[PDB]
């Protein structure tokens, strides 16, 4: 299959991927792109409107963050589930996850969960009693 | 296999690997001498595809560090790439595993490590997975 000289790598990989896309479309999607599901972003998944959440000394971290993120893929999903965030060009631990790490007394209030454009997550903690 | 698209409208071939890395499930493996070049690693990364920088073309932590810095300067913000290390020469590993740990501590965009020419033992694999702080480990069983 190696014949065309000095074909850009972009072209080679895009040709393979587009061939796969076209064959998959014709086979399993009836040659209709409208059948393809849409997400806000693609990636970050491991191979393995109003609410209040409360933490204890035994709250499971993963379930806590899953509840905080929600179900729809959006900015909140990424904020509470992405492991890293991008600095200038570097990768550092997601500060949002460490700020919200569950502990006794933390109360997270979610408002407007359904409309992501206006969702507000408010964390309240015991200060001065 | 399934098809999925993002907000921009870009179609993706949905797969376990693709679901994890957020890019089409096609990678260019670590090749000494083809992927030793930072320019080709950068061109492949910037095309939106995975590639592994070949450790077989470097003989010290300093030379590989210079190559990695070149790659980083050549890629866009938020891009990532991997590194391929050969398991037969212990010297390569001896200076390369600490280098990967150090660079990941500094936050360098090194997504994954691929070990070619042999599969590490359980203890060595556990050490890699625990300390290196990578997204995933690549192995090439024979």
UniProtKB/Swiss-Prot annotation, chain A:
Family note: Belongs to the fungal fatty acid synthetase subunit beta family.
Organism (species): Saccharomyces cerevisiae (strain ATCC 204508 / S288c) (Baker's yeast)
Other noteworthy facts: Present with 91800 molecules/cell in log phase SD medium.
Record text on subunit structure and interactions: [Alpha(6)beta(6)] hexamers of two multifunctional subunits (alpha and beta).
Entry function: Fatty acid synthetase catalyzes the formation of long-chain fatty acids from acetyl-CoA, malonyl-CoA and NADPH. The beta subunit contains domains for: [acyl-carrier-protein] acetyltransferase and malonyltransferase, S-acyl fatty acid synthase thioesterase, enoyl-[acyl-carrier-protein] reductase, and 3-hydroxypalmitoyl-[acyl-carrier-protein] dehydratase.
Record's protein name: Fatty acid synthase subunit beta
């Amino acid at each position: 299959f190696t014949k065309v000289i000095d074909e850009p790598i972009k072209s080679i990989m895009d040709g393979i991927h587009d061939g796969h896309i076209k064959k998959l479309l014709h086979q399993y999607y009836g040659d209709d792109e409208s059948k393809i599901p849409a997400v806000e972003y693609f990636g970050g998944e491991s191979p393995v409107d109003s609410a209040v959440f409360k933490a204890t000394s035994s709250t499971d971290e993963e379930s806590w963050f899953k509840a905080l993120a929600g179900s729809e893929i959006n900015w909140r999903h990424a904020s509470f589930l992405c492991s890293f965030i991008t600095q200038d060009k570097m990768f550092v631990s997601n500060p949002i996850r460490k700020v919200f790490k569950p502990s006794q007394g933390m109360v997270v209030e979610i408002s407007n969960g359904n409309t992501s454009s206006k969702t507000v997550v408010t964390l309240s903690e015991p200060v001065q009693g | 296999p399934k098809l999925i698209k993002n907000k921009s409208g870009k179609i993706f071939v949905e797969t376990k690997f693709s679901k994890l890395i957020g890019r089409p499930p096609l990678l260019v493996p670590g090749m000494t001498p083809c992927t030793v070049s930072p320019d080709f690693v950068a061109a492949t990364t910037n095309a939106g595809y995975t590639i592994e920088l070949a450790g077989g073309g470097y003989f010290s932590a300093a030379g590989m560090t210079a190559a990695i810095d070149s790659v980083v300067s050549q890629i866009e913000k938020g891009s990532t790439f991997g590194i391929n290390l050969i398991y037969v020469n212990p010297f390569m590993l001896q200076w390369g595993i600490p280098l990967i740990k150090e660079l990941r501590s500094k936050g360098y965009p090194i997504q994954f490590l691929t070990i070619g020419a042999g599969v590490p033992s359980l203890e060595v694999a556990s050490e890699y997975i625990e300390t290196l702080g990578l997204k995933y480990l690549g192995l090439k069983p024979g």
